[PDB]
């Protein structure tokens, strides 16, 4: 993936 995904909380 080009970006990491932050936690939603």
């Amino acid at each position, epitope marked *: *993936y080009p*970006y990491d*995904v*932050p*936690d939603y*909380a």
Partner: antibody
Amino acid sequence: EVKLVESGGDLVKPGGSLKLSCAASGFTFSSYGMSWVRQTPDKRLEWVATISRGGSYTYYPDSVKGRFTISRDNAKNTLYLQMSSLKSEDTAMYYCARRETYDEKGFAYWGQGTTVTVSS
Amino acid sequence: DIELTQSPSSLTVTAGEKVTMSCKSSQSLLNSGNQKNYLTWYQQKPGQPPKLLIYWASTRESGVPDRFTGSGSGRDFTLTISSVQAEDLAVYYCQNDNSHPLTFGAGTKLELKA
């Protein structure tokens, strides 16, 4: 089928160190965040750490911040929790759990857990 | 930190009876992005991890009997069992899953009346 297996649980000396690991299977590891959550002898549940899917964001509550490091190895499908400066109150069953990166519904998938006992 | 108060702490029941559990939170659990209350309810039985029962406050997980209903909004949340079964004897935990730090209630334990 989604499966999480924790290991590393042991008796720790006062102020000692310990590293837990959790082997993931039955899903694409690299596409989901992961967490550690612990349950103390009094049965209270406490969130310990969360990691992003790529490993670049980590989160901790104040109770373990500076002492606990959550990491992952996406090639080996393994989640890690390195603990430092452990105290008796860190005694708990430690569970790894998947973070529902798509649905955002809480912890649907938990391992069976590993016991950590810390001397006072 | 968000604090979750579960009452009562334990509750003695008779099979068939309606039960009502309460989770009150110190702050709102509204995910502003999508207007859902990110409160999750879990069920724990001896020798096993907590089991997700209800999410987004009111959506039943797959395979959970429809005698379990989650409800409420803002700060006041309830878990109802329309007709309690001996297989539902367990500790019930609510969880703030909306904002760090993630926090759990202390649990409501269901026990059978002697």
